[PDB]
Amino acid sequence: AKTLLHQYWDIPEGTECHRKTYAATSIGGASGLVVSAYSVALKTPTSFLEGVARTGRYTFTAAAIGAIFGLTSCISAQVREKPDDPLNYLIGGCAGGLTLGARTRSYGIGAAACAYMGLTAALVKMGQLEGWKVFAEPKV
Amino acid sequence: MNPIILIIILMTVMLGTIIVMISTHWLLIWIGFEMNMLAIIPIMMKKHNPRATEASTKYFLTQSTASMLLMMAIIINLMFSGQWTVMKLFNPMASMLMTMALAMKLGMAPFHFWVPEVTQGIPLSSGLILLTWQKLAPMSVLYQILPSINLDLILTLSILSITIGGWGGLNQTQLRKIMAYSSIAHMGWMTAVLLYNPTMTLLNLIIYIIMTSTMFTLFMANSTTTTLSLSHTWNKAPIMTILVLITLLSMGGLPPLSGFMPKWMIIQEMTKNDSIILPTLMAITALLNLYFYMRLTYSTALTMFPSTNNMKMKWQFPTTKRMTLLPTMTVLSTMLLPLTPILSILE
Amino acid sequence: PFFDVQKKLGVDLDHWMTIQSAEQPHRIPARCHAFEKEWIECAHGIGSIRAEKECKIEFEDFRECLLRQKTMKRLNAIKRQRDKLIKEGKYTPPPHHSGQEDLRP
Amino acid sequence: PGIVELPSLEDLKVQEVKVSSSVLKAAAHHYGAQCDKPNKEFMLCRWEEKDPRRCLEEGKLVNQCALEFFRQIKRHCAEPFTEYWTCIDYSGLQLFRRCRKEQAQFDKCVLDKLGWVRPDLGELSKVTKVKTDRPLPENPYHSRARPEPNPEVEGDLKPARHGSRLFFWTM
Amino acid sequence: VAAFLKNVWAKEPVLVASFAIAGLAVILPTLSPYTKYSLMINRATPYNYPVPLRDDGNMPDVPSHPQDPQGPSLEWLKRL
Amino acid sequence: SMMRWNRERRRLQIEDFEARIALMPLLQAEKDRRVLQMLRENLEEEAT
Amino acid sequence: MSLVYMNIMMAFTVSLTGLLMYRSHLMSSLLCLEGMMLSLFILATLMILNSHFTLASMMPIILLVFAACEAALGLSLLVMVSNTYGTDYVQNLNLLQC
Amino acid sequence: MFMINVLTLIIPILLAVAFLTLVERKVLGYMQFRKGPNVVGPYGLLQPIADAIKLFIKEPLRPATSSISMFILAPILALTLALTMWIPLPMPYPLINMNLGVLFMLAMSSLAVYSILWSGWASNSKYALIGALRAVAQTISYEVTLAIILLSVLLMNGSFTLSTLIITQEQVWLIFPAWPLAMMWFISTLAETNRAPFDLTEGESELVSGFNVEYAAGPFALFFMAEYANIIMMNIFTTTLFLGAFHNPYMPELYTINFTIKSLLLSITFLWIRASYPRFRYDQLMHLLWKNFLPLTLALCMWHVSLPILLSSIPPQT
Amino acid sequence: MNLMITLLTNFTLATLLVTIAFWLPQLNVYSEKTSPYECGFDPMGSARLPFSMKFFLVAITFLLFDLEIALLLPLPWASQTTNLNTMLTMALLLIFLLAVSLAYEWTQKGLEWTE
Amino acid sequence: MMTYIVFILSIIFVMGFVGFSSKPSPIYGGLGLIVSGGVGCGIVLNFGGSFLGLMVFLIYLGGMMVVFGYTTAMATEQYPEVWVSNKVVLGTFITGLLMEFLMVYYVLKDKEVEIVFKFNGMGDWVIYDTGDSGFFSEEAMGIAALYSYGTWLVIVTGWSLLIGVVVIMEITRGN
Numbered sequence A: 001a002k003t004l005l006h007q008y009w010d011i012p013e014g015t016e017c018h019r020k021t022y023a024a025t026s027i028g029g030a031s032g033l034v035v036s037a038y039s040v041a042l043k044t045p046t047s048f049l050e051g052v053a054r055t056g057r058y059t060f061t062a063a064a065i066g067a068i069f070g071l072t073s074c075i076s077a078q079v080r081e082k083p084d085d086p087l088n089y090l091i092g093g094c095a096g097g098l099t100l101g102a103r104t105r106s107y108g109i110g111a112a113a114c115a116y117m118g119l120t121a122a123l124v125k126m127g128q129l130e131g132w133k134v135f136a137e138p139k140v
Numbered sequence B: 001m002n003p004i005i006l007i008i009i010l011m012t013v014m015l016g017t018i019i020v021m022i023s024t025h026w027l028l029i030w031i032g033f034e035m036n037m038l039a040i041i042p043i044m045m046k047k048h049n050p051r052a053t054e055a056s057t058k059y060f061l062t063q064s065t066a067s068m069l070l071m072m073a074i075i076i077n078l079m080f081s082g083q084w085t086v087m088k089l090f091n092p093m094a095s096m097l098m099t100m101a102l103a104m105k106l107g108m109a110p111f112h113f114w115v116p117e118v119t120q121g122i123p124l125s126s127g128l129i130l131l132t133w134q135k136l137a138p139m140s141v142l143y144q145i146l147p148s149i150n151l152d153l154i155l156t157l158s159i160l161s162i163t164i165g166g167w168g169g170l171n172q173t174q175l176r177k178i179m180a181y182s183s184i185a186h187m188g189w190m191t192a193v194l195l196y197n198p199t200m201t202l203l204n205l206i207i208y209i210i211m212t213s214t215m216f217t218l219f220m221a222n223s224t225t226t227t228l229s230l231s232h233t234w235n236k237a238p239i240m241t242i243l244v245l246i247t248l249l250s251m252g253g254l255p256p257l258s259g260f261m262p263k264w265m266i267i268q269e270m271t272k273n274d275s276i277i278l279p280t281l282m283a284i285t286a287l288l289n290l291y292f293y294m295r296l297t298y299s300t301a302l303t304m305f306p307s308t309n310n311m312k313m314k315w316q317f318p319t320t321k322r323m324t325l326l327p328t329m330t331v332l333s334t335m336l337l338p339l340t341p342i343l344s345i346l347e
Numbered sequence C: 001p002f003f004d005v006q007k008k009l010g011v012d013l014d015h016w017m018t019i020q021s022a023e024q025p026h027r028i029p030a031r032c033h034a035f036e037k038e039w040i041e042c043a044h045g046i047g048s049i050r051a052e053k054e055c056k057i058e059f060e061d062f063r064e065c066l067l068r069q070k071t072m073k074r075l076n077a078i079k080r081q082r083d084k085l086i087k088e089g090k091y092t093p094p095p096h097h098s099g100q101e102d103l104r105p
Numbered sequence D: 001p002g003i004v005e006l007p008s009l010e011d012l013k014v015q016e017v018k019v020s021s022s023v024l025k026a027a028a029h030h031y032g033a034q035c036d037k038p039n040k041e042f043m044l045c046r047w048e049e050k051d052p053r054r055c056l057e058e059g060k061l062v063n064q065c066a067l068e069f070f071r072q073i074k075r076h077c078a079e080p081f082t083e084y085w086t087c088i089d090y091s092g093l094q095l096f097r098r099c100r101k102e103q104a105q106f107d108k109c110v111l112d113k114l115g116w117v118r119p120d121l122g123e124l125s126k127v128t129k130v131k132t133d134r135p136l137p138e139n140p141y142h143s144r145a146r147p148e149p150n151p152e153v154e155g156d157l158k159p160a161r162h163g164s165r166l167f168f169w170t171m
Numbered sequence E: 001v002a003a004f005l006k007n008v009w010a011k012e013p014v015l016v017a018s019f020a021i022a023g024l025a026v027i028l029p030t031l032s033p034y035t036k037y038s039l040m041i042n043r044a045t046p047y048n049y050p051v052p053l054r055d056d057g058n059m060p061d062v063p064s065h066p067q068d069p070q071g072p073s074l075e076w077l078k079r080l
Numbered sequence F: 001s002m003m004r005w006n007r008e009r010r011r012l013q014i015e016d017f018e019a020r021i022a023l024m025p026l027l028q029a030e031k032d033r034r035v036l037q038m039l040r041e042n043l044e045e046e047a048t
Numbered sequence G: 001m002s003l004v005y006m007n008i009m010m011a012f013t014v015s016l017t018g019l020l021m022y023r024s025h026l027m028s029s030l031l032c033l034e035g036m037m038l039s040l041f042i043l044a045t046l047m048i049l050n051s052h053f054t055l056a057s058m059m060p061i062i063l064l065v066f067a068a069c070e071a072a073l074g075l076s077l078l079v080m081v082s083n084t085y086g087t088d089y090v091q092n093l094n095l096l097q098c
Numbered sequence H: 001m002f003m004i005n006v007l008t009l010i011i012p013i014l015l016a017v018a019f020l021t022l023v024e025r026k027v028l029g030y031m032q033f034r035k036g037p038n039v040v041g042p043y044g045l046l047q048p049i050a051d052a053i054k055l056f057i058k059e060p061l062r063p064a065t066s067s068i069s070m071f072i073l074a075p076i077l078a079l080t081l082a083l084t085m086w087i088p089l090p091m092p093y094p095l096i097n098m099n100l101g102v103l104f105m106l107a108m109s110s111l112a113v114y115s116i117l118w119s120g121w122a123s124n125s126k127y128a129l130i131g132a133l134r135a136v137a138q139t140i141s142y143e144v145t146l147a148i149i150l151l152s153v154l155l156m157n158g159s160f161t162l163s164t165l166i167i168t169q170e171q172v173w174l175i176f177p178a179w180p181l182a183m184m185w186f187i188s189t190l191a192e193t194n195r196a197p198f199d200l201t202e203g204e205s206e207l208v209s210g211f212n213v214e215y216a217a218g219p220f221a222l223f224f225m226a227e228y229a230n231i232i233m234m235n236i237f238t239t240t241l242f243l244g245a246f247h248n249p250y251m252p253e254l255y256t257i258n259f260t261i262k263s264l265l266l267s268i269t270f271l272w273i274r275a276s277y278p279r280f281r282y283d284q285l286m287h288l289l290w291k292n293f294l295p296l297t298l299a300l301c302m303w304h305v306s307l308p309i310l311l312s313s314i315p316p317q318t
Numbered sequence I: 001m002n003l004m005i006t007l008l009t010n011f012t013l014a015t016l017l018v019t020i021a022f023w024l025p026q027l028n029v030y031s032e033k034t035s036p037y038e039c040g041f042d043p044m045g046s047a048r049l050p051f052s053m054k055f056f057l058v059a060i061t062f063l064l065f066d067l068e069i070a071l072l073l074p075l076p077w078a079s080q081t082t083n084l085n086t087m088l089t090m091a092l093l094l095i096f097l098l099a100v101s102l103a104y105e106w107t108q109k110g111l112e113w114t115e
Numbered sequence J: 001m002m003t004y005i006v007f008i009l010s011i012i013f014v015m016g017f018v019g020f021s022s023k024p025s026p027i028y029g030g031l032g033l034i035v036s037g038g039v040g041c042g043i044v045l046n047f048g049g050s051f052l053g054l055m056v057f058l059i060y061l062g063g064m065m066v067v068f069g070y071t072t073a074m075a076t077e078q079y080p081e082v083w084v085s086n087k088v089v090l091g092t093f094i095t096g097l098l099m100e101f102l103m104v105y106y107v108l109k110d111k112e113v114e115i116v117f118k119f120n121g122m123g124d125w126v127i128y129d130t131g132d133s134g135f136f137s138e139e140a141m142g143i144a145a146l147y148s149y150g151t152w153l154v155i156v157t158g159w160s161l162l163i164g165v166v167v168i169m170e171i172t173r174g175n
């Protein structure tokens, strides 16, 4: 789950939408698999078919989130010609939130997910620009 | 229970803890862990109800599996090292297995499931002994092997347990489940700082032990185990309501009370190394912990819930309980903040 | 809390077991006693950071004495090349590796 | 790393003491008593430098001495020695206590012919001193240079500068 | 205490015999003088090889031959 | 009777160990030479 | 390392996946626990005997002693569980869910 | 020529098992005022042959409600465990010289119980399960005292090797300094072999036929010769432990004939014990080895630990 | 090597007699011959019912005492030491602790069977 | 093939482990753990420690017989799934056996596998030693030295066992 992020981040932004779309869809698929596995372990499905249907629905939802997020961000950075900008990732996060609202079939979840995932995606671009560390190695 | 047998079992529990604490051998560490677990099993079976059997079985299975992982990590270190000394591990596989074993022993998420159930199913005194004494030997062993723990794994465990404990503490009306989720959050707080400065972890351990001991002694003295049973204390002894009010205010990290000192020093230590997002997230989940503390103190102190008729019969009798060290521990749990540089003695 | 009681009191409880080069019943030596002695004496009193930086050669040589990764690796290379040479037909084993050579003692 | 060193096969060739283990066990005490000096020189060197490649000429010398002792035995008392080692060799565990008669016969013949006295109980396990001419090996373990130790804390303990120096605390 | 001993020997003599045997086994090595001979016999059993020391020149106590007079002898093991 | 026979057996055991100790240097020399010869034979065939 | 180590740790991993996935029988999980301790014993004594750590030969006896002590504790807890409910099924221990 | 040695070990022991069934039936006749089998042949020498041929031409009778795998596996395990029991026994040279033979007998004694347990469990019967649990209780009664008796006896031998037990008592018999240990050892092997008065498994009165109440002929004969080989070798084990004979390395037949006579007299005493006493309960046996044998054995183990230190009589371990 | 040959010889001697005891004689197998034997009458329930055991405490302490005697078996080799007094003291103390455990069970009616 | 004796014994070891870790029925789980203990005793006996193998075999046989008594008392049902009687048990047994034989074929072809550590392909006769042990056995002398060196180990083990007896007697009390 480390080499997937390094596969995503090495491409320059706003250059090739297809490779970034595939990489972000891979991130979404991995997130969906781990979430669905925890879901079927902790909450037992009714039968086999229900379990595989729930797992597939979860990974398709998260794969859609990643795919359209990466496509929207790369398209925006291509059109604007400003690749090192958090605005592209803000539009990508809102497009992903709209996708989550369409997957859940509700507008309130869509609007809330647009706002919050846009804020988090913009903050992620800011951290990538300025080298913010979350799991920072000890210094002193 | 025979008091001689109970005294012998308690001294054996303490003996296992010091055998872990003073040994220079991994096998002796493991022996101390085994003897501690097998001596604290019957303390949890003091009242002999089915819930005690359930709690003892779940605790036994969790500690057994954690001990197996501990022994596997020890044996892999023996393979790749040829020695036995309690220091850093010479293999990342052994370090990861040892970290998960000590996380399972500490009740850290996502190995946190047994803690509220085990805490609920046993009496209040056994829960106090569990949540205070049993959470020292894994912390000691984690203090010994801090050169070898993977930072990402331990930080993931710490923030995961903080978030999960703070979220799970919002849906409980029993006091023991509330205390278990609070314990999970506090172990996340301590181990988030262990790789940066372990003196902060020792200070947090001491303050958390004092605070939760004061609260468990208060609950034992009032003989209340649910919030609706706690709400009768204003008709029984209002001073105990004042005491639980100030201790719940301190437990949420509200200054100028002594419970804010650990979180303040954790934030102080973790920003010397340019980690700013993480202490902010831990602060917000500490706010969630303060929320369910505020709900409890609204129930017991700041309002007068309706009482019953037999409370008059309880008024006519003065208490004869053995509230050992309750005022000293309450004072230490409330007003230890102007003596903050005392923490240097743990260096 | 490594409350070290053993050095404070002067007794030993598990110090005689913790290393491979300690005192043994009638002085039975281990397989890698000398390598453990060299690694221990290399990294005494300098701390763990300087131990992993300034005794890497001694420690990795001791670790190769323990598990023997590279020894069986070289033996695997020799065995595989000899088998391929035998199968292909460019090599014949000598008589002293066949079963009799009027052994030395 | 380094190419490992090994003496050639011409350096390892020697005449062998080709006898069974019963021949060695029967005349063990006489061999230990008579040939103590090259055996103990070889043992001292082999325990001192911890290397069989540097301990070859002394093994050669100990083989010549053992062969000379057995060739001396063969010249005088071949038949009592033959009967003695046969009576030793019949036993499954090679017991000493089943052939005390051949012990007395061999001891009497050797003592009257050559004048060798068997060691007493506990004598061959004694620890001796060996005078030899080889220099003492300075580095038998081939240890590298030891790392520099940490500097030692020294000096009088002054009081802390301006107290705690922790946030706003003046002491 | 004699009446109690008579009663316990009348009721369960096996426990009395076991307690007497265990007490005998506990208190006899303290008072017996033959244990040091067992210690010396165990010490004087040559499992290892007696490696010799380098003759620097000042060591007259250690012998130069197994038949030299100086050194630890085992006459007492023969006599006992 | 068992004490007498056990002490005699210990004397016999010490005598056997003394015989083995007297035999040790010759066996050690042959073992060193055999090990070095076998290593040289393995090395000389390793080049081929 | 050697392939016997592969098989011993592979047996340990089999019994670990056996213990962590229950089959509605507590005693079978106890058997898997004893299998894991047996695997630890075998692995420890293999390396100890190979590396000639002679003083450590007393260790696996102590490890197996504590294994049997915790097994006896598990059996006693199982007697209590089977004396409360009809059987020893692990799904009956669900009172602490509310 | 090892297979010839193995065959010449394993054939005479089962021949002697058949003739022990003959001798046991004759002695159990002659003590109870009557005769044994004396009609089939000259003084009944052909009765074991007739019994053996009869049992192998009768119906096999595998039950429908029984798990067939363990049902067939248990008698094979019983016979194989009784047959590999005899291997390190020195008469005066064992088939396989072993450094630790005593622990091998102890481990195989632990393993041989499982044939009884699985034959009881596999045959879907209540009487078979009763016999199986009685065997379980009997084993947890006797095993600790058996192992600690043998431990406290071997402390004067110096090692677990059975051949050293010949040398360690070549002066005097080992039954003299451990006569109480000899009596409790004899009782413990009476309980081990499921013989009277500690039968408690194949009880023909409390049950009908015990764990083999469903086993028809052929498979039942495997348990019969397994048990009789067990009693013969256990008497042989006692004879080696406490009644060692004079051994000449040039003439081993003297030790063989002395040892054979002593073990035959021990088996005669075994059948003598069989035809004299009522059978115990299966809880009275548990209160026998624990309340009466175990404390005295712990005391005797203290005594036999301190005594070689006391008299400087520590035996050699070589 | 000889031990595996001996074990295999014993095993194929044992499995030869069973295999000739199943195929040789004439068989007459019906749906009455293989019924469970309950002294002539039909059984009242299955034979796989829980057969309750009263000696559970004695079995648990059999495990503990088996491990106590497992610790005690190195004594013949441990008597060949030099630190003889410490070995004697630890052997005596271990056996005394075993006897203390047995006596505590005896005084607390643990060896007495339930019901 | 005979040089791979410990390999064959370890394959029977893993076969028994996956036989009883499927948890079919505790009777058959007991049979599987008996098999695994016996062949593990065999493995450690070819590595030289005969005493340790005999002790682990004896201890596990006693424990397995007592727990057999327990499951005949406590863990039993009307129709025990001995083997093949349940779908998931047979499936996981076949899965474990297939995985084990797969990695055996893999290590007997490439002569090197990488599961998280790295394991070599030859037999384990190579890692032996060419020297002699003299007139003693190392494992027996170590567990003999348990009494003369490990007094602290003796103290903690005896105390743990005594309080274990106390613990199990005060657990099964009922009130």
Ligand SMILES: CCCCCCCCCCCCCCCCCC(=O)OC[C@H](COP(=O)([O-])OCC[N+](C)(C)C)OC(=O)CCCCCCCCCCCCCCCCC
Binding pocket: E011, E012, E014, E017, E020, E021, H180, H182, H183, H184, H186, H187, H197, H238, H273, H277, H288, H292, H293, H296
């Ligand atoms: C192989 C060689 C020969 C072996 C000897 C045996 C051959 C003859 C066998 C006879 C028939 C046996 C049939 C089975 C009997 C089973 C019952 C049985 O035996 O139960 C055991 C019986 C049990 O007795 P019990 O059943 O009456 O128990 C009564 C229990 N209460 C009171 C609670 C009701 O005896 C024992 O347990 C004693 C064991 C042997 C003790 C040996 C002591 C030796 C002397 C010590 C010293 C004495 C002097 C004083 C102290 C001095 C100190 C310095």
Ligand SMILES: CCCCCCCCCCCCCCCCCC(=O)OC[C@H](COP(=O)(O)OCCN)OC(=O)CCCCCCCCCCCCCCCCC
Binding pocket: E008, E012, E015, E016, E017, E018, E019, E020, E022, E023, E026, H291, H295, H296, H298, H299, I096, I099, I100, I102, I103, I106, I107
């Ligand atoms: C210091 C010596 C070494 C000590 C450590 C080693 C001990 C080795 C032996 C271990 C014995 C373990 C079992 C002991 C159990 C004692 C308690 C007990 O069960 O007593 C019961 C018995 C009366 O029988 P009852 O009440 O009917 O029992 C129920 C059914 N039988 O009660 C009795 O019969 C009375 C029991 C107590 C009194 C015994 C007195 C023996 C005196 C012997 C002579 C003096 C020996 C010197 C040492 C002093 C000993 C007190």
Ligand SMILES: CCCCCCCCCCCCCCCCCC(=O)OC[C@H](COP(=O)(O)OCCN)OC(=O)CCCCCCCCCCCCCCCCC
Binding pocket: H097, H098, H099, H100, H101, H104, I001, I002, I003, I004, I007, J034, J035, J038, J039, J041, J042, J043, J045, J046, J050
């Ligand atoms: C499905 C049900 C089961 C069906 C199959 C049943 C198979 C037969 C079961 C009975 C036999 C089990 C044997 C278990 C191991 C016994 C080990 C043993 O007997 O060791 C004795 C001996 C010890 O040697 P030592 O004292 O050190 O002296 C040699 C020094 N010169 O050792 C020696 O002398 C060494 C001889 C060679 C040893 C080779 C290694 C052991 C071989 C084990 C094979 C597999 C056994 C499987 C047992 C399964 C039991 C359920």
